[PDB]
From TrEMBL, chains A, B, C, E, G:
CDD domains: archaeal_Sm1. Gene3D superfamilies: 2.30.30.100. The keyword Thylakoid does not apply. Keywords: mRNA processing, Ribonucleoprotein, RNA-binding. One of its GO terms (molecular function) is RNA binding. One of its GO terms (cellular component) is ribonucleoprotein complex. Belongs to the snRNP Sm proteins family. One of its GO terms (biological process) is mRNA processing. The lineage of its organism: Archaea, Thermoproteota, Thermoprotei, Thermoproteales, Thermoproteaceae. Pfam families: LSM. It comes from Pyrobaculum aerophilum (strain ATCC 51768 / DSM 7523 / JCM 9630 / CIP 104966 / NBRC 100827 / IM2). InterPro entries: LSM_dom_sf, PTHR15588, Sm, Sm_dom_euk/arc, snRNP_Sm-like_arc. It comes from the Archaea. This is Putative snRNP Sm-like protein.
Amino acid sequence: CFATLGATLQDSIGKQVLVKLRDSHEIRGILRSFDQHVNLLLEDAEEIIDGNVYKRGTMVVRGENVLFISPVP
Amino acid sequence: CFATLGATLQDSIGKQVLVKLRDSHEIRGILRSFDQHVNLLLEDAEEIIDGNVYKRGTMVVRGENVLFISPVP
Amino acid sequence: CFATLGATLQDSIGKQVLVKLRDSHEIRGILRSFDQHVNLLLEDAEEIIDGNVYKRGTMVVRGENVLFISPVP
Amino acid sequence: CFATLGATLQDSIGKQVLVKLRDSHEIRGILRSFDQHVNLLLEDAEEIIDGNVYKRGTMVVRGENVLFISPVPG
Amino acid sequence: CFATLGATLQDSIGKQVLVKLRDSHEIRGILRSFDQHVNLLLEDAEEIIDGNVYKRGTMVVRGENVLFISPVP
Amino acid sequence: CFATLGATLQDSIGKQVLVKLRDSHEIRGILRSFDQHVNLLLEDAEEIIDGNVYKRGTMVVRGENVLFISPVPG
Amino acid sequence: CFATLGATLQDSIGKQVLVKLRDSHEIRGILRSFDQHVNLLLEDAEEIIDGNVYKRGTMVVRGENVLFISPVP
Ligand SMILES: O=c1ccn([C@@H]2O[C@H](CO)[C@@H](O)[C@H]2O)c(=O)[nH]1
Ligand SMILES: O=c1ccn([C@@H]2O[C@H](CO)[C@@H](O)[C@H]2O)c(=O)[nH]1
Ligand SMILES: O=c1ccn([C@@H]2O[C@H](CO)[C@@H](O)[C@H]2O)c(=O)[nH]1
Ligand SMILES: O=c1ccn([C@@H]2O[C@H](CO)[C@@H](O)[C@H]2O)c(=O)[nH]1
Ligand SMILES: O=c1ccn([C@@H]2O[C@H](CO)[C@@H](O)[C@H]2O)c(=O)[nH]1
Ligand SMILES: O=c1ccn([C@@H]2O[C@H](CO)[C@@H](O)[C@H]2O)c(=O)[nH]1
Ligand SMILES: O=c1ccn([C@@H]2O[C@H](CO)[C@@H](O)[C@H]2O)c(=O)[nH]1
């Protein structure tokens, strides 16, 4: 009787997640924190660009451009 | 005497749906939860990219970037 | 002495309509329901992509990306 | 002492207008109705795509994605 | 002790201006009216597209897509 | 104990600034005025298009499409 | 029991940060200030365009077009 998206992100704290953003951006990282707007705090994050992988470390991601968030299987 | 879009989504719970997003993204998965902004929780989700299928598993999709959702026939 | 766009959509219930969206999407389907934000419920819908036609069936379309809706003559 | 954009649209009722939208869309038709958000109802509308004309008839256009509306001189 | 953007546009009434919009649109015309949202009423307007010049005459432009407005020297 | 972005802009009045906008636009001009929404008034402005400079003069820029503002060094 | 994104940014004051924006813009600089909307004040900022570095100095970045902010490791 309530949406479970929030419960899902809470369950993802500490897990690696795949995040895709507007303008064809693809990021992977450990989800450490997030808010109701889907703004995210990732650690050990990395960008995947045309097969290249660039480690970034800590990353704050604005929710407005997030397409989806998926815990890596 | 009321729009039936929400009713359609409720009826799609547990069914596979095709979801297209901004920037030509195409995703398929089992609809498990959603809210009034069309934010979605999908299970057994996959992206269709250039004819290939990438399995992702659990996926939270932001409604703001959703173009359409269609239960797979 | 009032805009007649809503009356036009009401009159299009049950008719086939052409809908184009942001990012060059073109869809055709039977309009079954809609709301004041132009969110739409289509049945027997199909996507037209580069000459290809993909049948989808039931489709919920977010009005925010809708460019136009035109009852098929 | 007030903007006249609204009066211009009122004056275009019944006239053909050229309308361009986001993502390079170009449409023409007779303006039959409009609101303050620039949502439009066109009759005898047609899309101009790569120099070719596609007749659509009645068309509801969302103002959110309109760039400009220009009554056709004629 | 106040922003002077509004004053500038007021001073441009009756002048020819260059207006550039989202998606690479470039327009020239005489500014006849405007509002606080930068919506514009132009007369004797023309579009400049890849070297082509198409005369349009009267044009109502939505401020939301305006990039800049520059009265022509 | 407060953001200093507005103070930076205030300090930029009279200086030439580089402004880049959505859709790859690059502009330069003297910052003369601005508001809390980052709408800008530029004088002696110019666009840089494909390496070439096009002088425009006075220009009103909408903050919504602004990516960044940077006073030109030296 | 609260999101830690804001605290991450506070901790990054005086640090080198990598910032990516809409339309494929990539910027590097020292974070000097910021607000709740992710508008940023950067110093010794530079743009990375096609693999080359363009030094810009002081830069105010609008949060609305920011994709992510990542403190350089
Ligand atoms: O698209 C999304 C993804 C996640 N959530 C989270 O799920 C809860 C829904 O009420 C919120 O706390 C929020 O953090 C949303 O609301 N929307
Ligand atoms: O595009 C859509 C899909 C669904 N709904 C339904 O309408 C309510 C909108 O807030 C929600 O509860 C949802 O079920 C919409 O309005 N728009
Ligand atoms: O694009 C549209 C279509 C319809 N409506 C309104 O929604 C109602 C639908 O019956 C009408 O009264 C009409 O004013 C809009 O505001 N915008
Ligand atoms: O871009 C435009 C075009 C027209 N109007 C007119 O101004 C009024 C604003 O509420 C409406 O009645 C409408 O006709 C605008 O405000 N903005
Ligand atoms: O950057 C801008 C552009 C326009 N305006 C509004 O547009 C009108 C321009 O003369 C003014 O009344 C003002 O309210 C602004 O506030 N900021
Ligand atoms: O991007 C910006 C620029 C300025 N300001 C604030 O808005 C006021 C404009 O005069 C200033 O005091 C400043 O703190 C912002 O919030 N964001
Ligand atoms: O993405 C972000 C980054 C920071 N903040 C908050 O906005 C304030 C800016 O000073 C901080 O206290 C911080 O908690 C957010 O809400 N979202």
